[PDB]
Protein backbone atom coordinates (compact mmCIF):
# COMPACT_ATOMS: atom_id res chain seq x y z
CA UNK A 1 0.00 0.00 0.00
CA UNK A 2 2.82 2.46 0.75
CA UNK A 3 4.46 1.81 -2.61
CA UNK A 4 1.08 2.03 -4.33
CA UNK A 5 0.58 5.43 -2.75
CA UNK A 6 4.06 6.56 -3.80
CA UNK A 7 3.38 5.48 -7.37
CA UNK A 8 -0.04 7.13 -7.31
CA UNK A 9 1.64 10.35 -6.25
CA UNK A 10 4.22 9.97 -9.01
CA UNK A 11 1.30 9.57 -11.42
CA UNK A 12 -0.30 12.62 -9.84
CA UNK A 13 2.77 14.77 -9.25
CA UNK A 14 3.57 14.91 -12.98
CA UNK A 15 0.54 14.25 -15.21
CA UNK A 16 -1.63 11.50 -16.63
CA UNK A 17 1.62 10.02 -17.98
CA UNK A 18 2.34 6.87 -16.01
CA UNK A 19 5.57 6.03 -17.86
CA UNK A 20 7.36 9.03 -16.37
CA UNK A 21 6.10 7.92 -12.95
CA UNK A 22 7.64 4.49 -13.52
CA UNK A 23 10.92 6.05 -14.64
CA UNK A 24 10.93 8.35 -11.60
CA UNK A 25 10.47 5.37 -9.30
CA UNK A 26 13.13 3.23 -10.94
CA UNK A 27 15.80 5.88 -11.32
CA UNK A 28 15.02 7.81 -8.18
CA UNK A 29 13.28 11.07 -7.79
CA UNK A 30 15.80 13.79 -7.22
CA UNK A 31 19.22 12.18 -7.16
CA UNK A 32 21.03 11.26 -10.34
CA UNK A 33 17.57 10.60 -11.54
CA UNK A 34 16.13 14.06 -11.49
CA UNK A 35 17.87 15.12 -14.57
CA UNK A 36 16.40 12.14 -16.35
CA UNK A 37 12.86 12.92 -15.22
CA UNK A 38 13.32 16.37 -16.72
CA UNK A 39 15.06 14.90 -19.69
CA UNK A 40 12.13 12.71 -20.42
CA UNK A 41 10.11 15.91 -20.69
CA UNK A 42 11.92 16.56 -23.99
CA UNK A 43 11.23 13.26 -25.87
CA UNK A 44 12.39 9.74 -24.89
CA UNK A 45 15.95 10.69 -25.57
CA UNK A 46 19.33 9.41 -24.67
CA UNK A 47 19.90 11.51 -21.61
CA UNK A 48 18.27 8.49 -20.07
CA UNK A 49 20.36 5.39 -19.47
CA UNK A 50 20.85 1.60 -19.61
CA UNK A 51 18.28 0.54 -16.98
CA UNK A 52 16.19 3.68 -17.38
CA UNK A 53 15.09 3.53 -21.00
CA UNK A 54 14.82 -0.27 -21.09
CA UNK A 55 12.70 -0.46 -17.93
CA UNK A 56 10.58 2.42 -19.21
CA UNK A 57 10.08 0.50 -22.45
CA UNK A 58 9.08 -2.64 -20.54
CA UNK A 59 5.97 -0.73 -19.43
CA UNK A 60 4.78 0.00 -22.96
CA UNK A 61 1.45 -1.49 -21.88
CA UNK A 62 -1.09 0.59 -19.98
CA UNK A 63 -0.79 3.61 -20.12
CA UNK A 64 -1.03 6.24 -21.73
CA UNK A 65 1.67 8.87 -21.91
CA UNK A 66 2.56 10.69 -25.14
CA UNK A 67 6.10 9.42 -24.72
CA UNK A 68 4.63 5.90 -24.63
CA UNK A 69 3.71 6.38 -28.27
CA UNK A 70 6.96 8.32 -28.64
CA UNK A 71 9.35 5.86 -26.96
CA UNK A 72 9.00 3.58 -30.00
CA UNK A 73 10.18 5.09 -32.06
CA UNK B 1 30.91 40.96 -34.11
CA UNK B 2 27.15 40.41 -33.78
CA UNK B 3 26.71 40.26 -37.54
CA UNK B 4 29.28 37.48 -37.92
CA UNK B 5 28.05 35.61 -34.85
CA UNK B 6 24.44 35.83 -36.05
CA UNK B 7 25.23 34.69 -39.60
CA UNK B 8 27.26 31.71 -38.41
CA UNK B 9 24.86 30.56 -35.70
CA UNK B 10 21.99 31.22 -38.08
CA UNK B 11 23.28 28.84 -40.72
CA UNK B 12 24.06 26.30 -37.99
CA UNK B 13 20.49 26.59 -36.70
CA UNK B 14 19.08 26.26 -40.20
CA UNK B 15 21.09 23.14 -40.98
CA UNK B 16 20.25 21.45 -37.69
CA UNK B 17 16.63 22.44 -38.40
CA UNK B 18 16.58 20.96 -41.89
CA UNK B 19 17.73 17.83 -40.11
CA UNK B 20 14.55 17.90 -38.01
CA UNK B 21 12.39 18.58 -41.07
CA UNK B 22 13.80 15.66 -43.03
CA UNK B 23 14.76 13.34 -40.17
CA UNK B 24 13.46 13.11 -36.61
CA UNK B 25 14.29 13.57 -32.96
CA UNK B 26 16.67 16.51 -33.21
CA UNK B 27 15.72 18.63 -30.17
CA UNK B 28 15.67 22.14 -31.67
CA UNK B 29 14.44 23.59 -28.37
CA UNK B 30 17.19 26.00 -27.30
CA UNK B 31 20.28 23.89 -26.85
CA UNK B 32 21.99 23.40 -30.20
CA UNK B 33 25.49 23.06 -31.54
CA UNK B 34 27.59 25.94 -30.26
CA UNK B 35 30.90 24.28 -30.73
CA UNK B 36 31.58 26.07 -33.96
CA UNK B 37 34.14 28.15 -31.96
CA UNK B 38 33.01 31.16 -33.94
CA UNK B 39 29.28 30.83 -33.29
CA UNK B 40 29.89 30.78 -29.56
CA UNK B 41 26.83 31.32 -27.43
CA UNK B 42 23.34 30.88 -28.66
CA UNK B 43 21.16 33.72 -27.41
CA UNK B 44 17.46 33.01 -27.45
CA UNK B 45 17.32 35.83 -29.98
CA UNK B 46 18.51 33.73 -32.90
CA UNK B 47 15.64 31.26 -33.17
CA UNK B 48 13.09 34.07 -33.31
CA UNK B 49 15.37 35.90 -35.71
CA UNK B 50 15.89 32.62 -37.56
CA UNK B 51 12.18 32.00 -38.02
CA UNK B 52 11.53 35.58 -39.10
CA UNK B 53 14.42 35.82 -41.56
CA UNK B 54 13.75 32.37 -43.00
CA UNK B 55 10.05 33.07 -43.46
CA UNK B 56 10.82 36.29 -45.32
CA UNK B 57 13.50 34.39 -47.26
CA UNK B 58 10.87 31.88 -48.37
CA UNK B 59 8.66 34.79 -49.34
CA UNK B 60 11.47 36.09 -51.54
CA UNK B 61 12.11 32.79 -53.31
CA UNK B 62 11.39 32.40 -57.01
From Swiss-Prot, chain A:
It is found in: Virion; Host cell inner membrane. Homotetramer. Interacts with gp15; after ejection the gp15-gp16 complex composed of a gp15 octamer and a gp16 tetramer probably binds both the viral DNA and the host inner membrane. Component of the cylindrical core that assembles on the inner surface of the capsid during capsid formation and plays a role in viral DNA ejection into the host cell. The inner core is composed of stacked rings of gp14, gp15 and gp16 proteins. Following binding to the host cell surface, the internal core is diassembled and gp16 is ejected along with gp14 and gp15 into the infected cell. Gp16 probably inserts in the host inner membrane and remains associated with gp15. Belongs to the transglycosylase Slt family. The N-terminus contains the transglycosylase activity (Potential). The C-terminus is essential for the viral DNA translocation into the host cytoplasm. This is Peptidoglycan transglycosylase gp16. The lineage of its organism: Viruses, Duplodnaviria, Heunggongvirae, Uroviricota, Caudoviricetes.
Swiss-Prot record, chain B:
Disulfide bonds: none annotated. It is found in: Virion; Host periplasm. Belongs to the T7virus internal virion protein gp15 family. Homooctamer. Interacts with gp16; after ejection the gp15-gp16 complex composed of a gp15 octamer and a gp16 tetramer probably binds both the viral DNA and the host inner membrane. Interacts with gp14. Component of the cylindrical core that assembles on the inner surface of the capsid during capsid formation and plays a role in viral DNA ejection into the host cell. The inner core is composed of stacked rings of gp14, gp15 and gp16 proteins. Following binding to the host cell surface, the internal core is disassembled and gp15 is ejected along with gp14 and gp16 into the infected cell. Gp15 probably remains associated with gp16. This is Internal virion protein gp15. The chain holds residues 375 to 436 of 747 of the full protein.
Amino acid sequence: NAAAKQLAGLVGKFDGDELKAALAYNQGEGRLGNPQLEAYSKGDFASISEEGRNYMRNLLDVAKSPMAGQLET
Amino acid sequence: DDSMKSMNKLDVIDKQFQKRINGEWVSTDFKDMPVNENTGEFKHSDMVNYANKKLAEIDSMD
